[PDB]
């Protein structure tokens, strides 16, 4: 029954729309997405899914019950000025934009109607295979059932939980950027397999299966990742020799550096936006 809109018909709109329709929670034709350029590739893929496309953001707003903001963060103020007069009391406005605060969104929208229902979320591209990692925070006028509705919807495409808004920039550096850390690691592990004599295709398949299985083990275990590691490492054995060379390069410190750098850049960009 629910009509869903995406302002911005790009990578994230495609990923969510694919996940929602694969989950069977939405019919593709009950989704509408808008972008200025109707000839983009993401738009073609959405079109082939059966999603409704239009260049006009107002049509997306008028179609939608739940309205996702899926444009780049510096575009958010422009489209809020554009469609703010079109937001109705029935709308739930879900901002997916990195860094952009609920306060900044409500300030724009409240100049039109007084009580906009805003939810901010951070998700990631694996919603496309229904294994996303999603957090959300509720705005000033978001009703209790608004947050419940959004958790049910986003749980259909992965993990979803409510957070205080002040955690979301850190979540962005961990699970928002996290898939890229994983793709980098998987490319490098495959190079390692190839160096040691494996065909590339097998090395890619085995590395990716190893990462998936290990992540699932941790999610299903009550034990600390160090204990799961201890269970792998036999005394004198192959694994503990390999963990040593990771440690000698400061492997752990690089991943900490990465989360920190993505979080800090997220905060720094929003600081630029608020100054502007």
Ligand X SMILES: CC(C)(C)[C@H](O)C(=O)O
Binding-site residue ranges: 7-12, 35, 37, 57, 70-73, 96-98, 165, 231, 238-239
Task: Please state, in angstroms and rounded to a whole number, the distance separating the CA atoms of residues 92 and 117.
Answer: 5
Q: Which partner from the list a second copy, ligand X, ligand NAI, none does 79 bind, CB cut-off 5 to 8 Å by kind? A: ligand NAI
**What's the closest the beta carbon of residue 188 comes to ligand NAI, in angstroms?**
21
233 binds ligand X, rule: CB under 6 A: yes
Q: Give the shortest CB-192-to-ligand NAI separation in angstroms.
A: 18
Read off the tokens for 196. Answer: 């040691």
- Single residue of 3, 64, 123, 156 touching ligand NAI by CB under 6 A: 123
Answer for which of 164, 166, 234, 244 binds ligand X (CB under 6 A) is 234
Quote the least distance from Cβ 178 to ligand X, whole Å: 8
Task: Print the binding letters for residues 16-55 with ligand X: x by CB under 6 A, - otherwise.
Answer: ----------------------------------------
- Per DSSP, helices labelled H in the chain are 11-22, 41-49, 57-63, 76-83, 102-110, 144-155, 168-171, 178-195, 200-220, 225-232, 238-248, 251-275
Residues 273 and 100 sit within 8 Å (Cβ to Cβ): yes
Tell me the pairing of strands 132-138 and 117-122: antiparallel
As a whole number of angstroms, the distance between CA 44 and CA 48 comes to 6
Q: How many chain residues bind a second copy (CB under 8 A)?
A: 116
Q: Is 239 in the site for ligand X (CB under 6 A)?
A: yes
Among ligand X, a second copy, ligand NAI, none, partner that 218 touches (CB below 5 to 8 angstroms by kind)? a second copy
Residue nearer to a second copy on the CB measure, 89 or 237: 237
Token readout for 193 is: 């397999």
Per DSSP, the three-state class of 204 is helix
Residue 95 as a binder of a second copy (CB under 8 A): the answer is: no
Task: Tell me if 72 contacts ligand NAI by CB under 6 A.
Answer: yes
Tokens of 75: 């575009």
**Residue 256 buriedness (CB in 10 A; 0-12 / 13-18 / 19+):** exposed
Interface ranges with ligand X (CB under 6 A): 98, 124, 172, 176-177, 232-234, 237-239
């Amino acid at each position: 029954s629910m009509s869903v809109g995406f302002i911005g018909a790009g990578q994230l709109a495609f990923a969510l729309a694919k996940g929602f329709t694969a989950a069977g929670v939405l019919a593709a034709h009950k989704i509408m997405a808008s972008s200025p350029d109707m000839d983009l590739a993401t738009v073609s893929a959405l079109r082939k899914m059966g999603v409704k496309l239009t260049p006009h953001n107002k049509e997306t707003v008028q179609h939608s019950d739940v309205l996702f903001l899926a444009v780049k963060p510096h575009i958010i103020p422009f489209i809020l000025d554009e469609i703010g007069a079109d937001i109705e009391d029935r709308h739930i406005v879900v901002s997916c934009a990195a860094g952009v605060t609920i306060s900044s969104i409500e300030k724009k929208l409240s100049a039109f109607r007084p009580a906009p229902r805003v939810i901010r979320c951070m998700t990631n591209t694996p919603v496309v295979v229904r294994e996303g990692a999603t957090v959300y925070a509720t705005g000033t006028h978001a009703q209790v059932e608004d947050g419940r509705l959004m958790e049910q919807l986003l749980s259909s495409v992965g993990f979803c939980t409510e957070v205080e808004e002040d955690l979301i920039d850190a979540v962005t550096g961990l699970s928002g950027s996290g898939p890229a850390y994983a793709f980098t690691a998987l490319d490098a592990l495959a190079d390692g397999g190839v160096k040691m004599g494996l065909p590339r295709r097998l090395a890619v398949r085995l590395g990716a299966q190893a990462l998936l299985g290990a992540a699932k083990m941790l999610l299903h275990s009550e034990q600390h990742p160090g204990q799961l590691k201890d269970n792998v490492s036999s005394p004198g054995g192959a694994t503990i020799h390999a963990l040593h060379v990771l440690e000698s390069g400061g492997f752990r410190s690089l991943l900490i550096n990465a989360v920190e750098a993505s979080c800090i850049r997220t905060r720094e960009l929003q600081s630029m936006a608020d100054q502007e």
